[PDB]
């Protein structure tokens, strides 16, 4: 049996705040050196985790998918009621499905992926939709320059067309700051290689959870300069993996997989049968190392003009980013730019969603 | 392979509010007829979802369990950071485990159970701890008389000693009130019997999600008075299943399984090889029907004096229930009655937990 990630969609919000603008407004260009971040996606109040989630699934789903999906999981840290139920209805997925959320800071989409996989193993005629959707929102706060919005959707099924997922995974929980992302990375990666007897050399690329690209660089840097072809190739694949994040910001649970996407669409050296290592992390903390192998033809499921699409985002002045990003419901809403779905209103106090 | 629920623990909070007292205070004994509820568990601020969860696991876990558990899931609708990470540390579970929360109103522990099961199938040397822990908290509100506190812990492993879980399950999601619990029950149960070709007659007991016992009675009542031995036996097992809930109140995600526990400890007619149907529900809505078979010896994992233990709860006047139940952190805390674990303080703003 081969089970894994068949398709990946991604949606961000429709506005962008440039770091240099934020810098000039707050009297800080140390975001370009410090965080290695150029711009962030800003979400209006009518585009929330649900509508970004639905957006990213609308990118990839077919009518057949919708008839065969019987599990919809929403990994998010951003109602009791799971966002996944709204997403299930907006997408028109067949009714005999489980829908729920999974939560553990930036880590949860990795657990959603594991459950999805085991579930398709067990019922190999089904498919599962994993959503990792978040809006990182902290003014004048030190988290302000690591804000972001977007969602990645993954369709998991057998004979996937992008990435075959492997059975060997290692998670770690430590009830517990850069020192942590890093120590969790070191200890998990070590035990991982010990238990499954693999080494940096068995891999073509390593992807990381990416709150901001500098932290991921640090984690990549922890990786055995003792392999020069490999050393260069790995650095290049790392640079390829952070490209999207540099324009979008922190998207919490989705960040690891947005890096995987940015890697598949931007590396020019990956081929079918190559193996990728992935390090998932969430504050608190929990981490997991898992791996995957590229399937022949995987480029056919990708997009080639994503960097162009992100440039279509409407730029905001800081004043208008403050106004739109921090708007709270009081409801009806101003019409803002959104993806295919939007929060239409609140009919007290039910959130009403629909196609725009 | 036989995989399933090996042990079940339960912890409620240490105070109890009698319905007749609430009734006299609010000028309403229509809780005893209406809801079929006598008393509810009230939780002080130092006993929250985490400490009740840890409590209920402390009931059942051994040192060996703790070395073999590599997944801790917290189903709750009550921090980003998953309660499960605190529970992992309080219980001293081995570090190479996944910890996270699952969320979808009262439904999520059913998904946690399914993932736990598939996971043990796939890695049959491991065990998983499923926690379903909640505090239902609504003064003068119409949800006031359906408040409650407690948590059920389930240890899932192969060759379980209580309940073998079966592969045939059916979930339904409908983005959407008694009419709903009921319509979701009817449609799911119907499709369930159609797809797996089973009938009311293949079962010794049916357990329901139990926000209050009257709603469950309604759902039981939807169940084919056309079987008189069975009809009586089923009614008796139903009455056995609601016994604990009548003293504790709504505990949201845990309620279905608290009913299963109340059934196993109070029916005098269940035997090894008997099959039980279970209907899980969460508002929003999602539902699932799943089944299980009793293992020989399952009584040995139960307790016989649980109704006695619940009578040890400290009774509160309404005035003092209002004071303790609705207390918000400002922190240090008054010392209240708790189970083995408690929220000690907040060290700004980290919740500090420990053994009491």
TrEMBL record, chains A, B:
<dbReference type="GO" id="GO:0006084">
    <property type="term" value="P:acetyl-CoA metabolic process"/>
</dbReference>
<feature type="modified residue" description="Cysteine sulfinic acid (-SO2H)">
    <location>
        <position position="106"/>
    </location>
</feature>
<feature type="binding site">
    <location>
        <position position="177"/>
    </location>
    <ligand>
        <name>CoA</name>
    </ligand>
</feature>
<keyword id="KW-0012">Acyltransferase</keyword>
<feature type="active site" description="Proton donor/acceptor">
    <location>
        <position position="209"/>
    </location>
</feature>
<feature type="binding site">
    <location>
        <position position="146"/>
    </location>
    <ligand>
        <name>CoA</name>
    </ligand>
</feature>
<feature type="active site" description="Acyl-thioester intermediate">
    <location>
        <position position="106"/>
    </location>
</feature>
<feature type="binding site">
    <location>
        <position position="218"/>
    </location>
    <ligand>
        <name>CoA</name>
    </ligand>
</feature>
<feature type="binding site">
    <location>
        <position position="250"/>
    </location>
    <ligand>
        <name>(3S)-3-hydroxy-3-methylglutaryl-CoA</name>
    </ligand>
</feature>
<feature type="binding site">
    <location>
        <position position="138"/>
    </location>
    <ligand>
        <name>CoA</name>
    </ligand>
</feature>
<feature type="domain" description="Hydroxymethylglutaryl-coenzyme A synthase C-terminal">
    <location>
        <begin position="221"/>
        <end position="328"/>
    </location>
</feature>
<dbReference type="InterPro" id="IPR013746">
    <property type="entry name" value="HMG_CoA_synt_C_dom"/>
</dbReference>
<feature type="binding site">
    <location>
        <position position="214"/>
    </location>
    <ligand>
        <name>CoA</name>
    </ligand>
</feature>
<feature type="binding site">
    <location>
        <position position="218"/>
    </location>
    <ligand>
        <name>(3S)-3-hydroxy-3-methylglutaryl-CoA</name>
    </ligand>
</feature>
<dbReference type="Pfam" id="PF08540">
    <property type="entry name" value="HMG_CoA_synt_C"/>
</dbReference>
<dbReference type="GO" id="GO:0004421">
    <property type="term" value="F:hydroxymethylglutaryl-CoA synthase activity"/>
</dbReference>
<dbReference type="InterPro" id="IPR011554">
    <property type="entry name" value="HMG_CoA_synthase_prok"/>
</dbReference>
<feature type="binding site">
    <location>
        <position position="138"/>
    </location>
    <ligand>
        <name>(3S)-3-hydroxy-3-methylglutaryl-CoA</name>
    </ligand>
</feature>
<feature type="binding site">
    <location>
        <position position="30"/>
    </location>
    <ligand>
        <name>CoA</name>
    </ligand>
</feature>
<protein>
    <submittedName>
        <fullName>Hydroxymethylglutaryl-CoA synthase</fullName>
        <ecNumber>2.3.3.10</ecNumber>
    </submittedName>
</protein>
<feature type="active site" description="Proton donor/acceptor">
    <location>
        <position position="77"/>
    </location>
</feature>
<feature type="binding site">
    <location>
        <position position="142"/>
    </location>
    <ligand>
        <name>CoA</name>
    </ligand>
</feature>
<dbReference type="InterPro" id="IPR016039">
    <property type="entry name" value="Thiolase-like"/>
</dbReference>
<keyword id="KW-0808">Transferase</keyword>
């Amino acid at each position: 049996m081969r089970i894994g990630i068949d398709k990946i969609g991604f949606t961000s919000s429709q506005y962008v705040l440039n770091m240099k603008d934020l810098a000039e407004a707050r009297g800080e260009q140390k975001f370009s050196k410090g965080l290695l971040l150029n711009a962030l996606s800003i979400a209006p109040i009518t585009d929330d985790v649900v509508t970004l989630a639905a957006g990213s699934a609308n990118e990839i789903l077919t009518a057949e998918d919708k008839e065969k999906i019987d599990m919809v999981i929403l990994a998010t840290e951003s109602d009791s009621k799971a966002g996944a139920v709204y997403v299930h209805s907006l997408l028109g997925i067949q009714p005999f499905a489980r829908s729920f959320e999974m939560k553990e800071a930036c880590y949860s989409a990795t657990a959603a992926l594991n459950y999805a996989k085991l579930h398709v193993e067990k019922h190999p005629d089904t498919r599962v939709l994993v959503l990792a959707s978040d809006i990182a929102k902290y003014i004048g706060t030190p988290g302000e320059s690591t804000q972001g919005a977007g969602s990645i959707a993954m369709l998991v099924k057998k004979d996937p067309r992008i990435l075959i997922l492997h059975d060997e995974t290692l998670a770690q929980t430590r009830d517990i700051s850069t020192k942590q992302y890093l120590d969790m990375l070191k200890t998990t990666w070590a035990e991982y290689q010990k238990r499954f007897d693999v080494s940096l050399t068995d891999f073509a690329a390593f992807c990381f959870h990416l709150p901001f690209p500098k932290l991921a660089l640090k984690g990549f840097n922890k990786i055995d300069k003792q392999p020069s072809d490999l050393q260069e190739k790995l650095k290049v694949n790392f640079e390829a993996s952070i490209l999207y994040s540099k324009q979008i910001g922190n998207i919490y649970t989705g960040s690891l997989f947005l890096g995987l996407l940015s890697l598949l669409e931007n590396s020019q050296n990956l081929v079918a049968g190559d193996k990728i290592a992935l390090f998932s992390y969430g504050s608190g903390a929990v981490a997991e190392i898992f791996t995957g192998t590229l399937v022949k033809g995987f480029k056919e499921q990708l997009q080639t003009n994503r960097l162009d699409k992100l440039k279509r985002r409407t730029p905001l002045s800081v004043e208008n980013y403050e106004k739109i990003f921090f708007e709270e419901a009081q409801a009806s809403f101003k019409e803002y730019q959104t993806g295919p779905f939007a929060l239409k209103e609140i009919l007290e106090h039910q959130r009403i969603y629909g196609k725009v």
